[PDB]
Amino acid sequence: RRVSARMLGDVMAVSTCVPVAADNVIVQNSMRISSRPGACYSRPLVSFRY
Amino acid sequence: EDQGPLVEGQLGENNELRLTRDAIEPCTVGHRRYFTFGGGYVYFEEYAYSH
Incomplete structure (x- = not known):
């Protein structure tokens, strides 16, 4: 099942993720960081509701 | 050897x-x-041996 993990050394931990419908998610028209010129996010931003 | 001197070292993988x-890293809160x-395994919490 879809889960998130992080190395706990030689073993891994796991947490169950909650699903979200597609209609409850939207991508912004731009990524631009007006507060810091020269810095750009590597992935697009999003806004959603559970 | 069974009668050899104790050598200083650090544990590794496998x-x-x-x-x-x-292998030094900044200390992080809630370490585990x-x-x-x-x-078996050795459990550590807050950079301290547990059991």
């Missing part, structure tokens, strides 16, 4: 014994890590 201690040791 029960590997490293002779150099250089299992590490393979022999046939």
